[PDB]
Amino acid sequence: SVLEEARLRLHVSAVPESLPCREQEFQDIYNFVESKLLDHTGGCMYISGVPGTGKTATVHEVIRCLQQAAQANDVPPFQYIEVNGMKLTEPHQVYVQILQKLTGQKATANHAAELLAKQFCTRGSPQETTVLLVDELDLLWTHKQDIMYNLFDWPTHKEARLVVLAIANTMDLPERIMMNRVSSRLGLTRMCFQPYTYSQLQQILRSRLKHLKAFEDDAIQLVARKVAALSGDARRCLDICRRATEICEFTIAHSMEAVDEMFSSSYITAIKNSSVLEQSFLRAILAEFRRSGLEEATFQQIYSQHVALCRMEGLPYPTMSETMAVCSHLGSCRLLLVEPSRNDLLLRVRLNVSQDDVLYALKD
């Protein structure tokens, strides 16, 4: 079916071959790495960008192009090694991972570091240029900063023949997280990926759905515009498109439903579906807050206000245990803030949502 084909095309893992939306950045990286590969000299580049900008996809596509060029005997052969920071149980274990990727030897963290140091500092046998990719750099931080210093200092050696690309989300990292000597080592080589404009998002969506007339232009334009105005991320755009397809299986209404179901908060409807006693408790809290003006109140005054409200409403007199159970249930779903493990009558209560939202939910 057409909807099934659109769902298949719009999946996240269905990476395209090459989209010129980032062709400029691709070209810049293609010049830099090509220069580092032609001169038999190492280098380092730091790239910072918000998630969803295609950093990993762009790097992998550049690696694919470089490997294809090497296969066409135009570039000297190179060894590619990829490591992910968040896929490692311990920080020091990255030394074992790289060593096992290059020689397959098993050694301790310190011994693996020493062997890697010996290989990268001593004039050994002439090896292929090493392309090292490290993902999620900020998660390799250590109070001693030895791992980061070694990672960004080793390619400085002529014998290293190592090119390192660091992908991260924060551009401030080399300034406030990295010390001076290594900050100057990554200085002036910082690539920032700006978020896609709504035109770029529309171009990407059109490329996803070439030769397929399944969505109207209006839904596509609105989805790209919401994405631009909220995060400018292709991942949530694909999720919205898939949800719109699912709802259409059941127009602009589908996209609106997707965006206001996957982004909007459910606090209002949760309060609406609350019980009568919980509503009375919330009203008592609001009345006590208006009387006092403070954002913290003990359980005793709230209980007194609840008893007064119940007397006004004609409800039966509530026991302390019942009110405590209701409060504990409310705190379980993170609508309030309380520590009722030991304190019972002296519990500080803070609202987890804005007062105006509570008023707008309770007026109806």
Partner 1 sequence: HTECLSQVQRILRERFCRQSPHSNLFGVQVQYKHLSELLKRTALHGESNSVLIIGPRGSGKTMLINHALKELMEIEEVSENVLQVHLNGLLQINDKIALKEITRQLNLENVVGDKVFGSFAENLSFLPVIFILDEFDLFAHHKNQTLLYNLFDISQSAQTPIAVIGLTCRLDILELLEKRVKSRFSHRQIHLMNSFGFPQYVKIFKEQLSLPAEFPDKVFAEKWNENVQYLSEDRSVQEVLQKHFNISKNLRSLHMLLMLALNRVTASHPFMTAVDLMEASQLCSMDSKANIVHGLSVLEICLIIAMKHLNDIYEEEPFNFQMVYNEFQKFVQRKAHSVYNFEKPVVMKAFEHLQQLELIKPMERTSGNSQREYQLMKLLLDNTQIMNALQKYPNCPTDVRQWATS
Ligand X SMILES: Nc1ncnc2c1ncn2[C@@H]1O[C@H](COP(=O)(O)OP(=O)(O)OP(O)(O)=S)[C@@H](O)[C@H]1O
Among the residue ranges 36-44, 48-56, 117-125, 171-179, the one whose residues contact ligand X (CB under 6 A): 48-56
Find the binder of ligand X among 6, 10, 22, 280 (CB under 6 A). Answer: 22
Residue numbers 23-52 binding partner 1 by CB under 8 A = 51-52
Q: Which residues pair with 163 in a beta bridge?
A: 43, 131
Site string for partner 1, 239-268 (x = CB under 8 A): x----------------------x---xx-
Task: Tell whether residue 56 is a contact of Mg ion (CB under 5 A).
Answer: yes
Q: In terms of DSSP H, where are the helices of the chain? A: 2-9, 23-38, 55-71, 94-102, 109-121, 146-153, 180-186, 198-208, 217-230, 234-249, 252-262, 267-272, 276-292, 299-313, 320-332, 355-363
The answer to whether residue 106 forms part of the interface with ligand X (CB under 6 A) is: no
Question: Exposed (0-12), middle (13-18) or buried (19+): which is 220, by Cβ within 10 Å?
Answer: buried
223 assigned to a ligand binding site = no
33 in Cβ contact with 63 (< 8 Å): no
Q: Which of residues 82-111 bind partner 1 (CB under 8 A)?
A: 86-87, 89-90, 93
The annotation status of 49 as a binding-site residue, yes or no, is yes
Quick one: which of 88, 25, 84 has its CA closest to 59?
25
Q: What x/- string results for residues 131 through 170 when contact with partner 1 is judged by CB under 8 A? A: -----x--x-----------------------------x-
Q: Does 223 bind ligand X (CB under 6 A)?
A: no
**Order of all β-strands in the sheet with 78-84:** 78-84, 129-135, 162-168, 43-49, 190-193
Q: Is 169 annotated as a binding residue?
A: yes
Integer angstrom CA distances of residue 26 from 39, 62, 167, 238: 20, 7, 15, 23
Question: Site for partner 1 (CB under 8 A): how many residues?
Answer: 44
117 binds ligand X (CB under 6 A): no
Total binding residues toward ligand X, as defined by CB under 6 A: 16
Should residue 19 be labelled a site residue for ligand X when binding is judged by CB under 6 A?
yes
Residues forming the annotated binding site for ATP?
A: 15, 49-57, 136, 169, 235
